[PDB]
Amino acid sequence: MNQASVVANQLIPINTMLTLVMMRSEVVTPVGIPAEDIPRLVSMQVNRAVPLGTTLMPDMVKGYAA
């Protein structure tokens, strides 16, 4: 298994605008937002709290479509 997902590098509070320090790339299951999309996620808002080590999923990011 090779596909990496975006994983929270810190707790991300509800309604926070994402910054690069908050997002790492990890091979996790289930698969979330592809790691290659990190640059596109900067300044987008999360619609819930994302604990440290949580996989970022498309439904957690306001305005995200792929």
Residue numbers in the entry: 0 to 65
Share the article's original sentences.
pmcIn the manuscript published in IUCrJ under the title ‘Modeling a unit cell: crystallographic refinement procedure using the biomolecular MD simulation platform Amber’, the authors described the results of the refinement of 84 protein structures using a novel approach that utilizes molecular dynamics and the maximum-likelihood potential that encodes the structure-factor based restraints. In our opinion, the only example for which the re-refined structure was deposited in the Protein Data Bank (PDB) does not provide convincing proof for the superiority of this refinement method.
The structure was originally refined at 1.9 Å resolution, but it appears that the refinement was not finalized. In particular, the deposited coordinates lacked any solvent that should have been visible at this resolution, thus despite good validation statistics, that structure has to be considered of uncertain quality. In the procedure used by Mikhailovskii et al., the original unit cell that contained a single protein molecule in the asymmetric unit in the space group P212121 was expanded to P1 with identical unit-cell parameters, but containing four independent molecules. Thus, the number of refinable parameters was significantly increased, though the amount of available diffraction data remained the same. Their re-refined structure consisted of 1952 protein atoms and 155 water molecules. Waters were added automatically in Coot on the basis of 3.5σ peaks in the Fo − Fc electron density map. The process took less than an hour of human time and negligible computing time on a standard PC. However, if more parameters do not lead to better agreement, the strict Ockham razor should be mercilessly applied to avoid unnecessary complication of the problem. It is clear that, at least in this case, the complicated procedure involving molecular dynamics did not work any better than manual refitting and standard crystallographic refinement.
